[PDB]
Amino acid sequence: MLLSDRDLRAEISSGRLGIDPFDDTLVQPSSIDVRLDCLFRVFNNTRYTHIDPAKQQDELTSLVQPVDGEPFVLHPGEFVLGSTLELFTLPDNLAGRLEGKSSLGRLGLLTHSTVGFIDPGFSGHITLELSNVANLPITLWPGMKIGQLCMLRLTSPSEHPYGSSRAGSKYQGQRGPTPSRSYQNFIRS
Amino acid sequence: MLLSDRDLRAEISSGRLGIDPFDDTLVQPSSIDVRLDCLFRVFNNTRYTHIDPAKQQDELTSLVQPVDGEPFVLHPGEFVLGSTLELFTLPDNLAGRLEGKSSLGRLGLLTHSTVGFIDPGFSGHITLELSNVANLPITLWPGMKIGQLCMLRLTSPSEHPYGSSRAGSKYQGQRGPTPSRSYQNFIRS
Amino acid sequence: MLLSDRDLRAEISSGRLGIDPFDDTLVQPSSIDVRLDCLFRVFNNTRYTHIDPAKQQDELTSLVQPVDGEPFVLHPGEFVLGSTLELFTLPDNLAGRLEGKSSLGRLGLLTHSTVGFIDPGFSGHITLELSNVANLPITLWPGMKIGQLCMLRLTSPSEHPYGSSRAGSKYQGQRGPTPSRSYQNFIR
Amino acid sequence: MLLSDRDLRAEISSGRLGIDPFDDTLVQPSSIDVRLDCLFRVFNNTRYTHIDPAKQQDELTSLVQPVDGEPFVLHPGEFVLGSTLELFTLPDNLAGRLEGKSSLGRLGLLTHSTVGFIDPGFSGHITLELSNVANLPITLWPGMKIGQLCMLRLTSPSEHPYGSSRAGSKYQGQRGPTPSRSYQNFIR
Amino acid sequence: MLLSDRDLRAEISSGRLGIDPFDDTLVQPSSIDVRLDCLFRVFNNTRYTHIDPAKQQDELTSLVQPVDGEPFVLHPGEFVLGSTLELFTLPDNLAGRLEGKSSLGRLGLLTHSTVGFIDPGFSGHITLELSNVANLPITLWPGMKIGQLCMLRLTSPSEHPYGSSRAGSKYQGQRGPTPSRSYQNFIRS
Amino acid sequence: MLLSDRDLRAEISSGRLGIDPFDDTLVQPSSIDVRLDCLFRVFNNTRYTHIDPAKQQDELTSLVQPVDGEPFVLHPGEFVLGSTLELFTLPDNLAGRLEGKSSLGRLGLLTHSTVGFIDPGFSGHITLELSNVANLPITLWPGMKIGQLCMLRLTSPSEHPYGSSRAGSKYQGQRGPTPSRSYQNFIR
Ligand SMILES: Cc1cn([C@H]2C[C@H](O)[C@@H](COP(=O)(O)OP(=O)(O)OP(=O)(O)O)O2)c(=O)[nH]c1=O
Ligand SMILES: Cc1cn([C@H]2C[C@H](O)[C@@H](COP(=O)(O)OP(=O)(O)OP(=O)(O)O)O2)c(=O)[nH]c1=O
Ligand SMILES: Cc1cn([C@H]2C[C@H](O)[C@@H](COP(=O)(O)OP(=O)(O)OP(=O)(O)O)O2)c(=O)[nH]c1=O
Ligand SMILES: Cc1cn([C@H]2C[C@H](O)[C@@H](COP(=O)(O)OP(=O)(O)OP(=O)(O)O)O2)c(=O)[nH]c1=O
Ligand SMILES: Cc1cn([C@H]2C[C@H](O)[C@@H](COP(=O)(O)OP(=O)(O)OP(=O)(O)O)O2)c(=O)[nH]c1=O
Ligand SMILES: Cc1cn([C@H]2C[C@H](O)[C@@H](COP(=O)(O)OP(=O)(O)OP(=O)(O)O)O2)c(=O)[nH]c1=O
Ligand SMILES: [Mg+2]
Ligand SMILES: [Mg+2]
Ligand SMILES: [Mg+2]
Ligand SMILES: [Mg+2]
Ligand SMILES: [Mg+2]
Ligand SMILES: [Mg+2]
Ligand SMILES: [Mg+2]
Structure with a gap:
């Protein structure tokens, strides 16, 4: 069961789904658009x-x-890590799916x-694996919409949610x- | 909540989910197989x-x-845009997910x-971003099955559906x- | 509607969802982690x-x-086929979605x-299309966690499930x- | 035996080595710099x-x-064909060697x-196979220096020179x- | 000083420059065209x-x-090793330079x-490093002309030629x- | 006309061709093997x-x-700049040709x-453009043999040698x- 715009706003303003900073104009018919942060990680070890x-x-x-006002340049066939501007807190009865945006695809x-x-x-x-498959470099502007997030209802609340010690979660409260x-x-075997 | 074959056909013949042209033999256990159009876009600007x-x-x-009867040749590491043969009309209480087919993957x-x-x-x-990751070129034949589409129920009807002016939608009624x-x-920033 | 850990276990121990071999410690809040097999297919025809x-x-x-104890080496921009260790049997009222793991992505x-x-x-x-987009080769170790699988409820049972002759299914009971x-x- | 600047100029002004249009400031210690034309061929068949x-x-x-004043953009990993501005006529007792320039390499x-x-x-x-191995596109400006050409003395004149029918030459008098x-x- | 056709033939028929098998129709104004063998090495270790x-x-x-009559297919961005059909024996007062052919370039x-x-x-x-930079695979036919070879006079005979133990040569009499x-x-340091 | 070993040594010990540091065991039948320095330039601007x-x-x-004793790792399809350990000084009647080594090719x-x-x-x-076309990364060890250099006689001495102001040379006395x-x- 997939939350619509009406039910997403309802989750956010009731404080059960956290988005910070939240912006109402980013709420789409079935999802919420998310924005690119200003830190990246490059694979440049030798x-x-x-x-x-x-x-x-x-x-x-x-x-x-990037120097402020400047873009990060993603080269053809390069692979970098980026982050979301927003911080997400999901309750234990909702699951999230992150997808790209058609305009960028x-x-x-x-x-x-x-x-x-x-x-x-x-x-x-959220950590983002950014990749370029075109034959030109792409300029990414910090703060741009980069993806979108929709919410699925679970059949029942999670017994051992993410971050709980039974799940053995590696990334609880991650930043950059x-x-x-x-x-x-x-x-392994 | 995901629609099964039974409930997909029911949506189509009740006229709430539009597929045109529709073909019954394309309905799969959980989804509906979709076909490739005959128009492509190549990134060949200099x-x-x-x-x-x-x-x-x-x-x-x-x-x-492609010249009629001939294939479009997708080169290794090339990226092109393609389209679906069918035209989709979704109601305001259903969402769609598009995936590739395992045979082509x-x-x-x-x-x-x-x-x-x-x-x-x-x-x-629907626009398709087609990519080749093998080491040989692949011949795409217009009219071939290229992917598949399933439908998810929303928790409640979309308040401001796609194409509505509150959503600010860029692609309503797109063609090629x-x-x-x-x-x-x-x-941005 | 997406099955939580509680309801996943319930499906497995009632014998309606088959996983073989099953391991309880692989159950995650919303999904179950799956492991890489030891057979691959490479595209090396000339x-x-x-x-x-x-x-x-x-x-x-x-x-x-791979020679036992050794890894399979996936070169940058290479594409191979792999398999899951586990054998999955889904009922006719459940669907599955396979995703990668964030640690490997x-x-x-x-x-x-x-x-x-x-x-x-x-x-x-399950056959896996494995790809490398970094600039270094990656060593894959057989039996490593490679992905995760969640289950969705269907609105009603499938009329003509997978493997039934009306569906025309190509991969029922696949091995490697x-x-x-x-x-x-x-x-066409 | 490799001709120096002194002996190159001597071959050109005696009319035995043809360069057209010739420009004296392009003569280097051991070679002569050549310039890019304004026509290209791209591999864009489908x-x-x-x-x-x-x-x-x-x-x-x-x-x-390229539209006049504009550059041709060579994308990373692309391969294109280009041409020299100049037309070269070698005698039957000299051989040429074409090399790139270190500034462009x-x-x-x-x-x-x-x-x-x-x-x-x-x-x-001369047809030039142009290639980009950087991670950024390169802008090529028509009329830019693109390479350089030096001349070797032969041990004796060529018995059946290029273009003669005994050699079976494919490219005599080529243009673009x-x-x-x-x-x-x-x-085969 | 670069040998012309006239002086190349003279070296061959005097037995000082060995080419085996020799074919007179391969002699070019300034060089001699060489053919591709039928064995390759591919880099397919895992x-x-x-x-x-x-x-x-x-x-x-x-x-x-390759199966006889069939070609070897060189994929875009693949690298293989090939060989020359001919066996070359240079004297100690001549040097050779190997270059590709314009038609193949x-x-x-x-x-x-x-x-x-x-x-x-x-x-x-001679071992050949064969590479494809086009976006299509190339079919290489065993026995095809694959390159060309010219000869330079040395200022004086080589004091310690190739294969002599003072040179420490790795490839004397190589086959495939x-x-x-x-x-x-x-x-190293 | 191409110098042999005998005549190369003769040029070096007469002080007309400079190689520094010179090592006699690097002289080959027709050329002289050259070694990789320990500084590189990577193209990692964003x-x-x-x-x-x-x-x-x-x-x-x-x-x-590279950290001392460690190698530089050249990734598949990467492009870097390197340098020669040796410093070359050529006279005005010799030209040089740089080529790779067959073992590395x-x-x-x-x-x-x-x-x-x-x-x-x-x-x-000499600045070296280093490139990897295999499907695995290559480890380059500073001080390794990386290439080779042969000398050609010119027909007559260069009138305006490299570094002279008439030639307009960009790289005279370059270091890293x-x-x-x-x-x-x-x-243009
Ligand atoms: C997603 C995925 C599914 N599968 C399995 C489970 C699917 O039910 C099965 C078929 O996937 P499909 O996407 O339906 O493949 P197909 O439509 O090309 O072929 P078919 O006629 O059989 O429908 O393959 C894989 O083996 N690997 C994968 O990566
Ligand atoms: C997934 C997918 C969707 N679509 C269609 C269906 C989507 O409803 C529509 C828009 O997708 P979006 O992902 O919302 O594109 P967007 O957010 O960049 O632009 P917009 O302002 O319109 O929201 O595009 C494709 O054409 N191709 C695809 O591959
Ligand atoms: C899909 C995605 C998730 N995440 C976040 C949300 C997930 O709940 C979290 C972990 O994703 P997982 O796929 O569960 O990663 P994992 O199984 O390898 O590691 P773990 O032991 O923590 O389960 O990472 C990202 O940071 N980036 C992404 O692209
Ligand atoms: C071949 C080669 C030469 N060199 C040195 C030796 C050459 O005499 C010098 C210049 O080569 P050139 O090919 O002449 O470079 P250029 O013509 O673009 O610039 P210039 O105005 O200086 O002529 O560079 C390298 O540093 N690296 C190399 O790989
Ligand atoms: C090196 C080079 C030569 N040429 C010219 C000068 C050469 O004499 C001519 C042919 O080069 P060749 O190497 O002899 O080409 P080929 O042997 O494949 O074809 P042919 O039958 O004509 O010999 O091409 C170019 O146009 N571009 C280049 O890059
Ligand atoms: C250019 C070339 C040479 N050769 C042959 C002819 C050369 O005289 C021989 C060695 O070339 P070198 O360039 O001298 O190789 P090397 O210095 O790495 O090894 P060595 O210790 O043997 O000198 O290899 C090839 O097999 N393939 C080629 O492409
Ligand atoms: Mg959108
Ligand atoms: Mg199917
Ligand atoms: Mg997990
Ligand atoms: Mg110059
Ligand atoms: Mg060269
Ligand atoms: Mg020829
Ligand atoms: Mg050597």
């Missing part, structure tokens, strides 16, 4: 020879921030990739473009 | 130096149509790219592979 | 000049298996791509990383 | 599925010309491919960015 | 995580041979890897597409 | 939208130096872009991996 999801690789990424900007679910009980900023933490609790 | 979502960039794409043909939602009240053809219109109402 | 979805192209892929590993739908009544392993079968019943 | 050197493939390329501009020889007796413009003609006299 | 020129990496390449086929020089005294087949042997005698 | 050879673009590159390591000419009179280090200076004296 020491590592490979990425091993089983190891923590500290210096794999660098923090970059049509330019060749892939805006997350492969990763849907925002878990019930999640609280923090946060690097991968897969080495934590890594399993 | 004047622009970069893509700026904040500006309208008119001559960024060219319209192309396994060949290295991406269909949706970063984007998912179809808004309640939307009406028109439509270029990006992100410059319209563009916000 | 005879074909193009891919035609309308023709069956037999030798388009090769089967590869942040590394540049795209796990499926462009396909989300598991059909009511589907039974088999299965090649594309689009040539079957191809329309 | 009908062909592969390149077969053994077949003539007519519509493989399109002719493009350092920007990521590959300017000819993997080819260097200008055969004795060749006459015509000329598409490949490998299908002519193709052996 | 165990190594990086290339270290300092280590021998045995299974880095696989030997492949214009199709997007790079025939070697930045490499040029063939050393006085060298004897064997031979993998890199840089690990032999590798120096 | 402000510029395109490369314009006609404008100086200051912050286009960054200086990077076979690994997928491109070592100069399209260029090759070293001008008579040139003095300084020097960025492009094409904007200087740019014509």
Whole structure:
């Protein structure tokens, strides 16, 4: 069951779904448009020879921030991490889905990739995997709309929400473009 | 809540969900298979130096149509825009999700790219961002199944559906592979 | 309507949703984490000049298996097919959605791509389209968590589920990383 | 034996080595700098599925010309054909070698491919295979210096020079960015 | 000083410059056209995580041979190793330079890897680094002309020619597409 | 006319061809092997939208130096600038040609872009355009042999050698991996 605009506003003003800062004009028929932050992470290490999801690789990424008023330039075939301006707090009976915007998709900007679910009980900023598949570089302007977020009802409240210790959650209360933490609790055969 | 085949047909023959032209044999257990049109847009401009979502960039794409009976050839690492053969009209209490087909995915043909939602009240053809990630070119045949569409029930009807002036919608009643219109109402810092 | 952890377990232990082998610690607040198998398919043919979805192209892929304890190395811009360790059986009133994991996405590993739908009544392993978009190769370890699966309620049971002959389904009971079968019943 | 600036000028003003239009300020210590024309060929066909050197493939390329004053934009990983402003006529006792310029190499501009020889007796413009390996598009301005050309003495005059019918030459007197003609006299 | 056709034939028929098999119709005004063999090496290992020129990496390449009458298909952005049909034996007073052919360069086929020089005294087949920069795959036909070879006079014969033990040569008498042997005698800081 | 080993050593020990530091065991039958320095330039700017050879673009590159004993990792499809350990001084009657090494070419390591000419009179280090075309990253070790240099005799001494003001030379006495200076004296 998917929340409409009427029921989204109702969740926000009742304080059960948190969006901060919230702006009413961003509410769309079925979802809410979200905006790009001003910090990015680039993959510009020259020491590592490979990425091993089983190891923590500290210096794999660098923090970059466009000079104010200037854009960040995403080169063709480059991959960077970005963040949402807004902070999201979901209750334990709602699930989120993050999708890109059609306007940007049509330019060749892939805006997350492969990763849907925002878990019930999640609280923090959202990390965005930004990718360019066009043959020109794209200029990203901090504060621009970058994606959109819709809410699904769950059948019943989550027994062990995100951030609870039974779930073993890696990203509760995350801030910037946060690097991968897969080495934590890594399993294999 | 996701509509099954039974309830999809029921929506179509009651005239609340529009598909044109409709073909019953395309209805799947949980979704409906959709077909590729015969118009494409290619990014073959040589004047622009970069893509700026904040500006309208008119001559960024060219319209192309395969000679009849011939295929469109998608080169490895190319990106093109395509369209659906069908025209979709959604009511204000249903939302749509577009996904690729597993048979094509396994060949290295991406269909949706970063984007998912179809808004309640939307009406028109659907633009497809087609990409090739294999190491060989892929021949696309106009009229082929290219993807699939499922419908989600909303919690309550959309207050300000797609195309309504409160939503500020850019694509209502779109026809061919439509270029990006992100410059319209563009916000930033 | 999306099943929570409580209702997922309830489906599994009532035998209506099959996961094999099942492991309870893989159940997440809204979904269940799934693990990578040890067979892959690589696109290393040098005879074909193009891919035609309308023709069956037999030798388009090769089967590869890492030497035991070793990883499979996914090169930047490479595309391979993988499989899930688990075998999934869905009832005819549930649908599934497969998504990647945020920890791996942040590394540049795209796990499926462009396909989300598991059909009511589907039974088999899941084939995964694995892709690397970083500028370094990634080591994939067999048995690692690779993705996650949630379940949606349908409005009513599927009239003609997956694998039923009215649906014309190509992949019922699939085993390894299965090649594309689009040539079957191809329309244009 | 490689001609120096002194001996190059001597060949040009004696009329044995033709450069047209010639400009004396383009002569360098060991070579002569050459300039980019204003016509290009782009590979933007969507009908062909592969390149077969053994077949003539007519519509493989399109002719493009920047609007006057504007640059041609070479995208990262694109490949285009260009031409020299100048027309070169070599005698039958000199051979030419074409190389890029270090100022452009350092920007990521590959300017000819993997080819260097200008055969004795060749006459015509030179086709340039232009390539970008940087991560940003490069703007090429018509009339810019794009490469350089030096001359080697042969041990003795060429018995059957370029363009002679015993050599079987495909490109004698070529004009614009000329598409490949490998299908002519193709052996296998 | 560069040998012309006249002086090339004279070297060949005097037995000082060896080409086997020799074909007179391949002699060009300033060079001699050379043909592609029928064995290739592809880089299709999945165990190594990086290339270290300092280590021998045995299974880095696989030997492949087109089925007879069929072509080898070089994919866009692929890199393979090939060989010359001919076996070259240079004297100790001549140097060779290998270059591609203009007809193939214009199709997007790079025939070697930045490499040029063939050393006085060298004897064997030549390994070719084959590369595709077009957006379509190229079909290479065994026995096709693939490049060309000219000869430069040296100021005086080579004191310690190629293959002599003072030179420390890695490839004397090579046969097929031979993998890199840089690990032999590798120096660093 | 191309100098052999015998005549190269003769030029070096007579002081007319400068190599510093020189090492005799690097002299090869027809050329002299050269070694990689320990500074690189990477193209990691995020402000510029395109490369314009006609404008100086200051912050286009960054200086990077591997931690001592560690390698520099060149990623597939990356492009960096490097330098030669040695400093070359050529006389005004010799020309140089730079080429890669076959052992590295076979690994997928491109070592100069399209260029090759070293001008008579040139003095300084040589800037190397390093490129990776394999599907795995390559580790470059500072001090490794990276390329080779041969010498051609000119017909007669250069009238206006490199670095002379008539030639208008941009790179005389260059030190590290020097960025492009094409904007200087740019014509169009
Ligand atoms: C999303 C996904 C599904 N599947 C499985 C579950 C689906 O029910 C099944 C079919 O997916 P479909 O998208 O329906 O594939 P298809 O429509 O091209 O072929 P068919 O005629 O069988 O419908 O494949 C995968 O194997 N891998 C995946 O990544
Ligand atoms: C997912 C998808 C949607 N659509 C259609 C259906 C959506 O209702 C419509 C708009 O999608 P949006 O994602 O909302 O595009 P937008 O937010 O950038 O622009 P707008 O101001 O109009 O909201 O586009 C496509 O054409 N192609 C696609 O791939
Ligand atoms: C989809 C998405 C989610 N998130 C957030 C919301 C999710 O609830 C949270 C974790 O997503 P998960 O997919 O659950 O990541 P994970 O399973 O690898 O790690 P964990 O142990 O924490 O479960 O990350 C992002 O930051 N970026 C994204 O693109
Ligand atoms: C081939 C090569 C030369 N060089 C040196 C030797 C040359 O004498 C010098 C200039 O090469 P040029 O090719 O002449 O560069 P340029 O013509 O663009 O600039 P200029 O005005 O200086 O002529 O650069 C390198 O630094 N790196 C290289 O890869
Ligand atoms: C190197 C080069 C040469 N040329 C010219 C000068 C050469 O003499 C001519 C042919 O080069 P070749 O290398 O001989 O081309 P080819 O052998 O494939 O064809 P042909 O039968 O004519 O020999 O092309 C270019 O146009 N562009 C270039 O980049
Ligand atoms: C240019 C070229 C040369 N060769 C042959 C002829 C050369 O004399 C020989 C070695 O070339 P080199 O460039 O000298 O290779 P190297 O210095 O890395 O190794 P070595 O210790 O043997 O000198 O390889 C090829 O096989 N393929 C080619 O593309
Ligand atoms: Mg929208
Ligand atoms: Mg289906
Ligand atoms: Mg999880
Ligand atoms: Mg110069
Ligand atoms: Mg020729
Ligand atoms: Mg050597
Ligand atoms: Mg060269």
